[PDB]
Design a protein around this ligand. Structure first.
Ligand SMILES: [Zn+2]
Lengths: 73, 58, 365, 405
C-alpha cells in the first residue's frame, strides 16, 4: 500500500498525495534486515522476518467519530 | 495492598491520600484511580482487526 | 378524477444490469434548458438526457468498480459560485462523492460514517448543506463549502438505531428523521445554538485552527414519538405544518404533532400525545428502503411500487386527500420502482426500475 | 491539464510499486536496513564522528543530524542517537528482541537535543573538528548555528529560539552549506541568488548573534545548488551552478569573479560537486544532462568515463573516503548511484553491458521523492545516511561481498 504519509490516504480528491508541500507526521523507525548470514547456495532454500519498529507509524482517529486525528492535534 | 484496597482519605492520613488534593499524582501510588488521573490513549485501525487503542507514552 | 394525464415517451437500459435505488430530477434547471435526470445502481452511475417527441438519449456514464462499492442516493444540488449542477452519491463504504458532469470528475469525498449512507437531502435556503443519515445509529449534517461536519444529531437520547431516511420542512426550519427504531424523533434547527453553529461553519477554516471543528452533539431531540409507527419508518415528508411520514404499512400517515389547537412551533418537548389526520392507502407496497418525492407545487405526490404500478396524489384541494386519484401503468413495467421524480414544471415524470431502466413520462399540459 | 494530472497520478502509483519491489531486496544487497521517519520532514543528513562501545553493550554510540522542513509548527532542529550491530551482529542469537548485537528496542532512534528553529532547515553540516557546533540554512537571509549541548532538551511549546550565532550574509533563500574538515570553522554556503557565500566561523565571538559574511563568491551566472571543499587541500573548493560550469575556485586568489577552473564540463544545468580524499584526483559532479562525469585535477579538459546512468538533475554527489576508487551521486531522479573505476574502460561480458556501464557499480533505489542529502559514515565502512523529501531518513550499508577476492 502507500508507503508515504498516511495523512494523504484519506485526503479529499484533488489534494491526496498531490505533493503541494511538506506534510507533518509522527516519528517512526523501521528495522527489518538485521544481518545477512552470507551463506552458500543450498537446494533446501529453493524447496520469520520479525521486523523491528518504533514510535508511531500510522494515522490516528478521534474518539467521538471517524474523523482522522492529525499529528498536530 | 493485602486487602486489595485503596486508601481512604479520612483514615489513611499521613500516607498521602488526603494531603494536596488539588495537585498532581500524590506520593501514595494506591490513589491514582481515586483521583481519576490516567494515561492518554489514542484510536487507530488495529493491526489485528478493527480499531485499537495505542498508548502515547510508555 | 384528477386533472393530470402523463404518457410514456421513451425508455432505455443500463450496461451493468443491476438494481437502481436513487433517482432524482434536476429541479434547479430553469425554463429553456431541456430536462436532465440521473440514476444510480451497482458500481457504475449513469446520467441521461431525454428530448421531446418520445426520445431518450444517454449523455454520460461513470463507473467505480475499483473496489466493492455501491450507491444508494442520488440527491441533486448545485454550486452557487460555479453554477453547474452536482450529484451526490454514497453507500457501501459510506464515501459521499459529489460528481460534476460538466467537468466529468469527482469534486469531494466524505468519510467518517460507521456504515453505508442510506439517504441524502439538501437544505433549501443554503444549497451547500447536506442531510446525511448514516447507518451507524446517527444522523449528520455536512457543509459542502468547508467540508466540515456541522452537527452530529444523535447521542444520549438520539438515534437508538440506524436512521433510514429523513426530510426537511417546507421552509427549512424543522428537520424530521425516520429510523429503524420505530421512532419519528425530530431535531429542530431553530435553536440559537443551531444558528451559531451554522454561522461558525460558514466562517470556519480547518487550516487556521489546530483544534478540530467543535460539532454540536444534539443528544436530546426537541420532540420524539414512537406510537405513530408500529414498525420501522423509511420515508418522511413535510406537508406544510403537518408530517407525511411513510413506513412499511403501505400507507403514508398525515399527522400533526401534539394536540389539535396547539401551535406546532410552540409545542413543548414534554408532549406525549399525537393525533392522526390523514393517511393515503395503497397495496402491494410492503418492501423496505423505498422513497417518494412529491411535486414542487405540492399538488402532486408520487410513490413508486414494487409490482410496477405508479400512484399520484392530489394534496391541494379542500380538506385532506380523499377519493382514489389515478394510477400510471407502463407497457414494459415489470421490475420494482424505488424512486420517482417530477420536474420543476409539472410536465415530465421519470420512474426508475430494479434494472436501471428509466421510464420517462410526459403530461399533456 | 487533466491528462497531465492523470499521468502524474499513474507515475506516483508506479513509483510506489517500484519502491515496494525495492524493499524486498534489502538483505541480498545491504548489510543493514535502518529507515526512520522523522516527525518533521528531513531536508538534510549528516554523520557525527562520536562513537562509544562499552563493555556489555556491543553497540556503538552513533549520532546523526536530522532536519525539519515543515511549513510552520514550532520549527525545530532534531539531533538523535543511533547504534550499530558491530562485529558481533547477532542477527538472531536466540535472544533478539534489544538485540544481541546492538540496541533493537527502546531508544533506537531516540532524540537527544531538539533546539527550536526559525523557518526551514536546508542543511545540517557540522564541524568535524568541533562536533558541538552545527550550522543550518533557512529561507531568510541569515544562517543558523546551534549547539546541542548548551541548548536545553525537551523543547517547550514555543518557538523562535535564539541560536546566539546567526550568519547573515545571504540575500535570498539558500540551499548550500559545507564545513572544512582540515581547518576548524570556514563554513561556505551556496544560495539561489547566483552566488556562494563563505563565513570565517572558527573562533566565532561569544554570543555572536550578528555575523557578517567573511567572503562572497559571485562568479556563476545562474543559480548555484552546492558548494564543497577539497579534502586533501583546504586552499580551494568547487562552485557548481545551473550555468553549464562545474567551476572550482582557489581560495586567497584575489579574484571573486573568475573561478580558477572554468571548464564547462557539461552542456546543461549542474547541481552537485564533490571530491575524494583517498583519490584526490577523482571528483564527481552532478548535472541536469544526466551525464555525471568524473574529472581529474591534472587533466580536466579531457573527458573520462562519464557515468551514463542518471535520468534527471543531480543535486548531491559524494565519493567514499575509506575506499580508493568508489564514488557516488544522487539527485532529483531519487537514485543513489555508486560509481566505480576499476571496471572503467575495460572489456565486459554482454550481460554486464546490458546491466549498464561497467564503471557504474551500485545504484540505490530506496527513495520516493527527490533525494535531499546523502553521506557516508566515517566510522562504519559502508554505512550511508540518505534522506528524501518524504520525511524518511535511511541508514544502510552497501554490501562488501562484491569486493571479495
Ligand atoms: Zn491505606
Amino acid at each position: 500500500s502507500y508507503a508515504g504519509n498516511p495523512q494523504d490516504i484519506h485526503r479529499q480528491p484533488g489534494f491526496a498525495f498531490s505533493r503541494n508541500g511538506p506534510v507533518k507526521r509522527t516519528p517512526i523507525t523501521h528495522i527489518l534486515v538485521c544481518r545477512p548470514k552470507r551463506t552458500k547456495a543450498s537446494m533446501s532454500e529453493f524447496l520469520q522476518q520479525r521486523t523491528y519498529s518504533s514510535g508511531h507509524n500510522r494515522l490516528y482517529f478521534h474518539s467521538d467519530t471517524c474523523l482522522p486525528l492529525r499529528p498536530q492535534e | 495492598y493485602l486487602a486489595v484496597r485503596e486508601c481512604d482519605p479520612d483514615l489513611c492520613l499521613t500516607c498521602g491520600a488526603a494531603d494536596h488534593w488539588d495537585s498532581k499524582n500524590v506520593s501514595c501510588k494506591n490513589c491514582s484511580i481515586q483521583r481519576g488521573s490516567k494515561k492518554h490513549l489514542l484510536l487507530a485501525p488495529s493491526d489485528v482487526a478493527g480499531w485499537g487503542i495505542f498508548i502515547k507514552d510508555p | 378524477k384528477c386533472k393530470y394525464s402523463f404518457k410514456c415517451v421513451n425508455s432505455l437500459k443500463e450496461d451493468h444490469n443491476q438494481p437502481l435505488f436513487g433517482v432524482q430530477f434536476n429541479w434547479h434547471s430553469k425554463e429553456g434548458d431541456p430536462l436532465v435526470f440521473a440514476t444510480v445502481g451497482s458500481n457504475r452511475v449513469t446520467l441521461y438526457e431525454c428530448h421531446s417527441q418520445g426520445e431518450i438519449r444517454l449523455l454520460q456514464s461513470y463507473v467505480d468498480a475499483d473496489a466493492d462499492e455501491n450507491f444508494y442516493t442520488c440527491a441533486w444540488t448545485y454550486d452557487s459560485n460555479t453554477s453547474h449542477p452536482l450529484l451526490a452519491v454514497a453507500g457501501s463504504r459510506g464515501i459521499i462523492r459529489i460528481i460534476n458532469p460538466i467537468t466529468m470528475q469527482c469534486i469531494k469525498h466524505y468519510v467518517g460514517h460507521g456504515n453505508a449512507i442510506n439517504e441524502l437531502k439538501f437544505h433549501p435556503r443554503d444549497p451547500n448543506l447536506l442531510l446525511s443519515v448514516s447507518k451507524d445509529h446517527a444522523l449528520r449534517l455536512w457543509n459542502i463549502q468547508t467540508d466540515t461536519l456541522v452537527a452530529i444529531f444523535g447521542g444520549v437520547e438520539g438515534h437508538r438505531d440506524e436512521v433510514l431516511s429523513a426530510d426537511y420542512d417546507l421552509l427549512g426550519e424543522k428537520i424530521m428523521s425516520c429510523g429503524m427504531d420505530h421512532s419519528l424523533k425530530l431535531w429542530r434547527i431553530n435553536s440559537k445554538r443551531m444558528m451559531n453553529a451554522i454561522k461558525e461553519s460558514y466562517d470556519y477554516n480547518p487550516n487556521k485552527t489546530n483544534r478540530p471543528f467543535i460539532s454540536q452533539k444534539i443528544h436530546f431531540p426537541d420532540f420524539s414519538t414512537r406510537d405513530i409507527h408500529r414498525n420501522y419508518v423509511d420515508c418522511v415528508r413535510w406537508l406544510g405544518d403537518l408530517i407525511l411520514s411513510k413506513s412499511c404499512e403501505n400507507a403514508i400517515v398525515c399527522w400533526k404533532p401534539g394536540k389539535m389547537e396547539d401551535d406546532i412551533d410552540k409545542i413543548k418537548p414534554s408532549e406525549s400525545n399525537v393525533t392522526i389526520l390523514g393517511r393515503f392507502d395503497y397495496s402491494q407496497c410492503d418492501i423496505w428502503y423505498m422513497r417518494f418525492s412529491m411535486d414542487f407545487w405540492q399538488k402532486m405526490l408520487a410513490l413508486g411500487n414494487q409490482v410496477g404500478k405508479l400512484y399520484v396524489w392530489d394534496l391541494e384541494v379542500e380538506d385532506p386527500h380523499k377519493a382514489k386519484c389515478t394510477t400510471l401503468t407502463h407497457h414494459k413495467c415489470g421490475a420494482a420502482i424505488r424512486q420517482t421524480s417530477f420536474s420543476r414544471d409539472s410536465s415530465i415524470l421519470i420512474a426508475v426500475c430494479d434494472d436501471a431502466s428509466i421510464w420517462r413520462w410526459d403530461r399533456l399540459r | 491539464d487533466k491528462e497531465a494530472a492523470f499521468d502524474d497520478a499513474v507515475e506516483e502509483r508506479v513509483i510506489n510499486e517500484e519502491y515496494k519491489i525495492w524493499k524486498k531486496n534489502t538483505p541480498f544487497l545491504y548489510d543493514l536496513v535502518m529507515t526512520h521517519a522523522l516527525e518533521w520532514p528531513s531536508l538534510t543528513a549528516q554523520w557525527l564522528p562520536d562513537v562509544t562501545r562499552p563493555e556489555g553493550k556491543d553497540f556503538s554510540i552513533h549520532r546523526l543530524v536530522l532536519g525539519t522542513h515543515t511549513s510552520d509548527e514550532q520549527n525545530h532542529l532534531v539531533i538523535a542517537s543511533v547504534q550499530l550491530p558491530n562485529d558481533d551482529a547477532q542477527f538472531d542469537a536466540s535472544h533478539y528482541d534489544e538485540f544481541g548485537g546492538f540496541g533493537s528496542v527502546s531508544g533506537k532512534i531516540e532524540i537527544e537535543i531538539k533546539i527550536n528553529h526559525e523557518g526551514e532547515v536546508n542543511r545540517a553540516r557540522y564541524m568535524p573538528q568541533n562536533p558541538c557546533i552545527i550550522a543550518t540554512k533557512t529561507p531568510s537571509s541569515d544562517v543558523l548555528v546551534f549547539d546541542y549541548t548548551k541548548h536545553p532538551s525537551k523543547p517547550d511549546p514555543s518557538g523562535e529560539c535564539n541560536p546566539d550565532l546567526r550568519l547573515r550574509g545571504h540575500q535570498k533563500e539558500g540551499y548550500g552549506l559545507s564545513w572544512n574538515p582540515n581547518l576548524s570553522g570556514h563554513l561556505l554556503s551556496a544560495s539561489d541568488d547566483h552566488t556562494i557565500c563563505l563565513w570565517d566561523i572558527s573562533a566565532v565571538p561569544k554570543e555572536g548573534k550578528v555575523v557578517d559574511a567573511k567572503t562572497i563568491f559571485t562568479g556563476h551566472t545562474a543559480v548555484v545548488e552546492d558548494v564543497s571543499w577539497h579534502l586533501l587541500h583546504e586552499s580551494l573548493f568547487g562552485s557548481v551552478a545551473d550555468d553549464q560550469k562545474l567551476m572550482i575556485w582557489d581560495t586567497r586568489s584575489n579574484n571573486t569573479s573568475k573561478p580558477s577552473h572554468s571548464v564547462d564540463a557539461h552542456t546543461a544545468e549542474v547541481n552537485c560537486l564533490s571530491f575524494n580524499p583517498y583519490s584526490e584526483f577523482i571528483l564527481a559532479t552532478g548535472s541536469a544532462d544526466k551525464t555525471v562525469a568524473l574529472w581529474d585535477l591534472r587533466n580536466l579538459k579531457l573527458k573520462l568515463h562519464s557515468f551514463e546512468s542518471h535520468k534527471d538533475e543531480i543535486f548531491q554527489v559524494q565519493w567514499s573516503p575509506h575506499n580508493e576508487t568508489i564514488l557516488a551521486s544522487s539527485g532529483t531522479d531519487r537514485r543513489l548511484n555508486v560509481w566505480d573505476l576499476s571496471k572503467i574502460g575495460e572489456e565486459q561480458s554482454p550481460e554486464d553491458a546490458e546491466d549498464g556501464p561497467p564503471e557504474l557499480l551500485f545504484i540505490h533505489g530506496g527513495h520516493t521523492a527527490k533525494i535531499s542529502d546523502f553521506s557516508w559514515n566515517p566510522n562504519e565502512p559502508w554505512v550511508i545516511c540518505s534522506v528524501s523529501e518524504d520525511n524518511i531518513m535511511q541508514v544502510w550499508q552497501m554490501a562488501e561481498n562484491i569486493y571479495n577476492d
